[PDB]
Structures are given as structure tokens and as C-alpha cells.
């Protein structure tokens, strides 16, 4: 099959900014070449065929240009509506194939996360579980580091953390880590402490509660 | 207004079958190319399945021998039945139209996708049908504490996806933040929903998330009281 | 009026248009291709692009696909 690969993967930009993205194919295309656009939880939209034709009512900081192994997208003028996650797809031969995608971010100035902390509820404690939660709101960039400490261990292997889309409003991300032990483990320890590392922080930001406290 | 509405998606042990449809309105849809693309985290977007004007049906090496496209012109559908499913078919199925561009040389197909319907969640898993677990993210302040407080919902531990989280039945959407799903090695999904709140707020205002589990018709209110 | 509309080529009632066209213009496979060609019926003959062709006609199926 042809492989497509983008550069780069992804990318910050301020409004008004020029994005340029491009598209590598492993053997010739021609021209055979769209651009798709896609926001999350939404389907693909086409903006540009035959590596440099407009579909109707794209606006007019879209171009596309190539042939050939190499193709460029290019926003000239980045909007708010433009943040999103581009696709070029060959139609070559079979089987049609993507890229891998490039996530054009907002670039804005680093904000440093509010943490909180939230222990277990007793209807978890009930079913022999503990859940113990970490909130890290509104920061910036996306680069984040949570460290789990219960007595002062550093917990592996036994949490995982999600991530929001960039905020609509403010441009932040926000990181939720849940770390999960039994009601027998979590009843045999009394400090719990979430520490979190970034760039918006001249030193880390440990946020604790003791059990039973 | 040319649409394209998916039915059928679900969720299935390996070995499973499941059957796909679309429904095409708002154009001639005997006329167009039809096809069938999937989305993960991992796969990105991948072409499955096309089946031209003419009848010639096409498929991705990854599902030949296991998926077959079908359409009845008549009824405006196209279906993909889904047969020995793995869990590497697990993704976002969308039905989706091949341009037709006329020129003076003639008539042109796929040179593109130009439609896309919005697509319907397969899920492969040797997990169970399970409704969530709703637990508190609950707040502690002190009686003068200021600034923000947060507040939320563990929900915990279903199958598959998807859930939905509203706050104070879609009264409350300010500084909510309700985070994508993970999955756990027991292959059942955790996710939380958090909002920022003036912290004096904790004393004042009632906060409950609404959760949604169609799969397992679960439905659960949670209240979220500061301890 | 009635006219040919694409992508179907077929005659079509637009009980609110006036006028039927023929609309083309080179997209980047015209060196491969031809013309894109745009069969429909408007209210009045539409305004298009500098690079762009356009033929408005106001009698039923005047605006055939252009074979000769």
C-alpha cells in the first residue's frame, strides 16, 4: 500500500499565524491528493482535491500545492474555527490511505495547574476498592508530571491519567490521574500525596490528605 | 440537504458478527461510489470497504475475508456485515461518498470522500456489558476558604463505550471538564467529570452529575456534597 | 423551469428558478481532464469567478451536458 507521512505530527500556533503541514508519499501520486479537516468527536470534512483545488466555501488562507512524493497544506492567516487535526488520503490506487494526521494546538502563554486531591468515598471502600484522584486545571503547555506518593512510595503501574482537548475559552488542558488500590492497601497507609511537575512551576506542587483526617 | 445516517454499530465478543447500515438521503445515491472508513487513537483513519456505481466492491487486506459491503439501491442503504471480528476492528465505523465530478473528458469517482456520515462506535472485547459505578470527587474547604474549589464524578468501571455526563440535568456547563474514557486491564473503562466552582459555592449550590450508559440502559444522579 | 442538473445530468422541475447554466472552469486535473462542467438552475443567471465560464439560458432543458 502507499504510505503517507505528515510533518509534523504536531504543531503550536497563534491566530494569524502561517501552518504549514506537509504530506510524503512512498511513490508517485500525481496529483491525486485531498486535504480533510477534523475536530474531535466530528467527522472528516474535504477541503482540498487534486492536491491544490478548493472544495466550495473553504476560505481563501487554505492552499494546497505538490506532486508527485510531496505536498504542502498551507494556512495563511490561522482562525480560532482552524484548530483541528488535518489528514492528506491518496487516491492513487487501492487501498486509499491517510496520514497520520497533524494536531494544529493554540500556542499561548504557560499557566501553571490548581490541584486538588479527592480521597475515596465510603460506597467505593464498601465494594473493597479505593480510588484516589488528582484534578490538574487549566495549565499550559500539555506537558504535565503526576508522581503518586502513599507514605512517601512512589506508586507505578497502579494509576492512569486522561487529558482534555485545549479549552474553547482559555487554551488549557486539564489532566485527571486516578490511582487505584484495594480497601486492605489503602486502609494499611496514612499520607496520600499527589506531586505535580511543569513548566508553570518553579518548584513542584504536592497536594496530601491523611487518611481518616 | 445530503445526508448519511449509520445504524447497527455495537459491541461483540471476538468470533462476533455485526451489520452496518446507511441510509443516503438528499442525493441520487444509486448513482455515487459508496464506502465504508474506520478511526482509532491507533489506526488513524483507514479505508475498509468500497462499493462503485458499477457493483465492483473493493476492501483493506485487514478485512478481506471477514467484512462484505453490500447496497440496495432501491431502499437508498448501504450495509457492511462484520464477521469474525478481532479486537483490532474496534473504531469509529463511517459511511461515506465518493465525489462524482463531471468534466468535458467525462464523469469522474472517488477521487475523494465528500460526504461522511457521523459515524457509529464498533466495539470488539471479550469484556461484559456493564453499567458504571458512580463515585464523589468530593470537595473539602475550610468555612473562609476562597478562590476555586473542584468537585466531581468517578464513573467507574463500564462496558463498553460510550458514557454521557451532563451537570445539574445541562444547567451547569462553566468550568467542566469531563475527561476522555482509559481503559482498564480488566478491559472495563473508568472516566471522570470534574467543574471548578467559587469555592463559597460548595455551601450554597446543589452540583449532581447525570450519567448515561444506553449500552447496559443504565442511568444514575449523582449528588456531590462537600465533606 | 425544468433543466439538466448535475450530477445527474437529468431534467429537473426548479419551480422557482428562471434561468438554467452551464458552469465551468479548470481545477488542477484540467490539463488531464478538461473543464469541470456544473449543469443547474438559478433564480437568475448566477455571477461567478474571473477563471470561470458561465452560460444562462431561460427555456426547459436548454442547458444539455456540452458533448459537441
Known sequence: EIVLTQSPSSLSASVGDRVTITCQASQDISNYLNWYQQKPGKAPKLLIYAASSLESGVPSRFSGSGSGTDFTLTISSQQPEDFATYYCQQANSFPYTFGQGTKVEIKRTVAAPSVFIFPPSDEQLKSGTASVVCLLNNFYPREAKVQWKVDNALQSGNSQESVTEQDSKDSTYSLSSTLTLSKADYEKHKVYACEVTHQGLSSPVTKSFNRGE | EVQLVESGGGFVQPGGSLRLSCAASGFTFSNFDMHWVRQSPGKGLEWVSGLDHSGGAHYAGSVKGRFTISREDAKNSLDLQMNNLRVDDTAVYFCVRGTLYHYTSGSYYSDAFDIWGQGTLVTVSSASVKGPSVFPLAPSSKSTSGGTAALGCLVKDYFPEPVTVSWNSGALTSGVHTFPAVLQSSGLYSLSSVVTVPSSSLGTQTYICNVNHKPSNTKVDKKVEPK | ?68
Open chain 3, 1 to 68: 423551469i425544468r433543466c439538466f442538473i448535475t450530477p445527474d445530468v437529468t431534467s429537473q422541475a426548479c419551480p422557482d428558478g428562471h434561468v438554467c447554466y452551464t458552469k465551468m472552469w479548470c481545477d488542477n486535473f484540467c490539463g488531464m481532464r478538461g473543464k469541470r462542467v456544473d449543469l443547474g438552475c438559478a433564480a437568475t443567471c448566477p455571477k461567478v469567478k474571473p477563471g470561470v465560464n458561465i452560460k444562462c439560458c431561460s427555456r426547459d432543458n436548454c442547458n444539455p451536458f456540452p458533448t459537441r
